[PDB]
């Protein structure tokens, strides 16, 4: 009745429990320490990508009151960001379906 098909080298107490561990864990050697070079590599990764976030190529956007306050009147702005159309590009490097978003 499917409970006598037990091979000889298999103990009888270690069956039935099942319940494989939550995540199989084997410590890889790719979790080593840090050096001057590794610290500098992390710092240069920090500068990069952050640079493009602070640049125009974001395309990820989806206190909003009805009146501009007197405090908002004659006030410093957030930032005059350089827009997607602002920076000059190469026209002959895009399909003709995208040129219209340029301020040619």
């Amino acid at each position: 009745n499917y409970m006598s098909n037990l091979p000889f080298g298999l103990g009888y107490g270690d069956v039935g429990k099942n319940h494989i561990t939550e995540f199989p864990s084997i410590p890889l050697p790719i979790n080593g320490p840090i050096t001057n070079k590794e610290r500098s590599l992390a710092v240069k990764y920090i500068n990069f990508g952050k640079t493009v976030k602070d640049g125009p190529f974001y395309t990820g956007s989806m206190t909003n009151d009805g009146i501009e306050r007197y405090s908002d009147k004659y006030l410093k702005k957030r930032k005059i960001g350089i827009s997607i159309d602002d920076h000059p590009y190469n026209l002959n490097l895009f399909p003709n379906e995208l040129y219209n978003v340029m301020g040619i």
Binding site: L41, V43, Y45, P88
Partner: protein, 568 residues
């Protein structure tokens, strides 16, 4: 018991069901560019070819302008390949791909600037290091960089006189190739536009037949495709001009884009040098760093000369492609070098005197000794064509090198007995349940534990032995097989998935501490963090920052094992 709510919270089983290729690309584009760009790139991964209409239809963003602006941004980032398929009976439209190598810049960025900094001849002075670092960051970030803008932005005449001098060096080396249709068009579409025109201009009643006209059409296509791919892969036509009463300069109106194949060759040679550093002592290993440094600049292809991606290789006489590849490697003398030529680049700090023992000073008879010993070494690093001058082969070096890497990765993940068993299956084709004991002589329980552990992957393929008209593996024995190609498939996807997970976790950490990271990346906060930040929040920020430093180190360390598997 771990709760199903406790699971899926720290276990991360929802991501385990993603295809690893999509996961990594999506996470890179998300953490670097943004969210809408991530959605677009993921949809591109799902559907290889589509139009802007189909993106509008398939993503929540229907705003035709919004998808367009994200697409021009992604195209700049070299993440998109496009084309125009000509509808004849109405309006002809376009289709956009996803360019895999356009995101490897976003993946290799740290290694990219590391190669750009380190590989140069002059690095003692500090200012040049910072200058080239900022220029390479600006180029890899913005994309197609224009000297017309760059010189205009530069403010000092004495400083404009050297940035123009660095562009020629990168163009000639191979880190700056003129950008054109070849980086923004798919290989199969190139070949299918170069493969039917030859079938349109042929006359009729030609005394040949379908097989003959097809073979000559394929020959003509291969010739023109090889020519037009050679033309922009490396040339002087960007800087071949020379202005009057001035210096040699690249053209001021054109754009410059930084390549990645040259950096991939640099990384591969770095892996070879590290292999030598583990295996061969540094006395004669310091030569190999420069021995490959001076040949990589004109080194041949690593996986595909791009004719093996847009079309089928062959069925009968299918040896032709590797035949011609090894034939070209043999014929081209640029890769062959003599003991005299190697002398003018070796630094003095390498003595080249005590690197030999003839029994139990920058001299050619000693550097040629290392040349010959590398050729005669068990791993065919170089092959001997002529007595005195040899060459490094890639016809029979990549398979054995990749198999060594695969074997040692499995051995690092598993035990020495697992390595012994995988090596038995490798060096003995068609092992069986008794040939294992014949060729191993290790205790059966341990060997079969390692066997069961290694079965789960694509390393070892197992054959069902049919004994009666019904096929059953329950009455008869069953022996083993290798089928190594699946094994190479497997190590690509697992590593790609793990890098995807790492990017996913750093994006999670950014999501969890967005306010803190935005505060950190502020002009006044930069450089002044001790007085401003109160001790508790400063401790939280420093701990999360060292965590991300460590995880970037982990990612970079994993960035030395998967690109080598990426080769064919």
């Amino acid at each position: 018991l771990v709760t199903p709510e406790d699971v899926m919270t720290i276990s991360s089983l929802e991501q385990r069901t993603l295809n690893p290729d999509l996961f990594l690309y999506k996470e890179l584009v998300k953490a670097h560019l943004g969210e809408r760009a991530a959605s677009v790139i993921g949809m591109l991964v799902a559907l290889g070819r589509l139009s802007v209409r189909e993106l509008v239809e398939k993503i929540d963003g229907m705003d035709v302008d919004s998808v367009k602006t994200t697409l021009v941004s992604l195209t700049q980032l070299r993440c998109v390949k496009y084309l125009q398929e000509t509808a004849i009976s109405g309006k002809k439209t376009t289709y956009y791909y996803y360019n895999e190598e356009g995101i490897h810049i976003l993946l290799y960025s740290g290694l990219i600037i590391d190669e750009i900094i380190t590989q140069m001849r002059v690095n003692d002075e500090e200012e040049h290091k910072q200058l080239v670092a900022e220029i390479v960051q600006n180029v890899i970030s913005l994309g197609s960089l224009t000297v017309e803008d760059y010189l205009s932005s530069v403010t000092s005449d004495s400083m404009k006189y050297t940035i123009s001098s660095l562009f020629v060096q990168l163009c000639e080396m191979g880190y700056l190739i003129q950008i054109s249709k070849l980086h923004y068009t798919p290989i199969e579409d190139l070949w299918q536009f170069l493969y039917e025109k030859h079938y349109k201009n042929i006359p009729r009643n030609s005394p040949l037949s379908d097989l003959k006209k097809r073979s000559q059409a394929k020959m003509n296509a291969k010739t023109d495709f090889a020519k037009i791919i050679n033309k922009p892969n490396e040339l002087s036509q960007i800087l071949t001009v020379d202005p009057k009463t001035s210096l040699r300069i690249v053209k001021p109106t054109v754009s410059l884009t930084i390549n990645l194949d040259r950096f991939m060759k640099g990384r591969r040679s770095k892996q070879l040098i590290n292999l030598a550093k583990t295996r061969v002592g540094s006395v004669t290993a310091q030569v190999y760093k420069i021995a490959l440094r001076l040949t990589e600049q004109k080194s041949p292809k690593i996986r595909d000369p791009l004719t093996q991606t847009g079309l089928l290789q062959d069925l009968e006489e299918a040896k032709s492609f590797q035949d011609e590849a090894e034939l070209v490697e043999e014929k081209t003398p640029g890769l062959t070098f003599n003991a005299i030529d190697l002398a003018r680049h070796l630094p003095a700090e390498l003595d080249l005197r005590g690197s030999l023992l003839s029994r139990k000073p920058h001299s050619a008879s000693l550097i040629n000794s290392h040349l010959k010993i590398l050729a005669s070494s068990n791993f065919p690093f170089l092959n001997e064509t002529k007595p005195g001058v040899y060459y490094v082969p890639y016809s029979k070096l990549m398979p054995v090198l990749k198999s060594s890497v695969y074997e040692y990765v499995i051995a690092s993940t598993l035990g020495p007995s697992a390595m012994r068993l995988s090596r038995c299956i490798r060096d003995n084709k068609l092992v069986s349940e008794k040939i294992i004991n014949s060729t191993a002589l290790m205790k059966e329980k341990d060997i079969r534990s390692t066997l069961a552990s290694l079965i789960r992957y694509n390393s070892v393929e197992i054959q069902e032995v049919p004994r009666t008209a019904d096929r059953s593996a329950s009455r008869a024995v069953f022996l083993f097989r290798c089928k190594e190609t699946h094994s190479y498939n497997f190590m690509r996807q697992n590593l790609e998935w793990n890098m995807a997970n790492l990017l996913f976790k750093k994006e999670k950490l950014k999501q969890e501490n967005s306010t803190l990271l935005k505060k950190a990346n502020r002009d006044d906060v930069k450089g002044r963090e001790n007085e401003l930040l109160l001790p508790s929040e400063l401790n939280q920020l420093k701990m999360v920052n060292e965590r991300e430093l460590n995880v970037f180190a982990r990612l970079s360390r994993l960035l030395s094992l998967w690109e080598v598997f990426q080769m064919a």
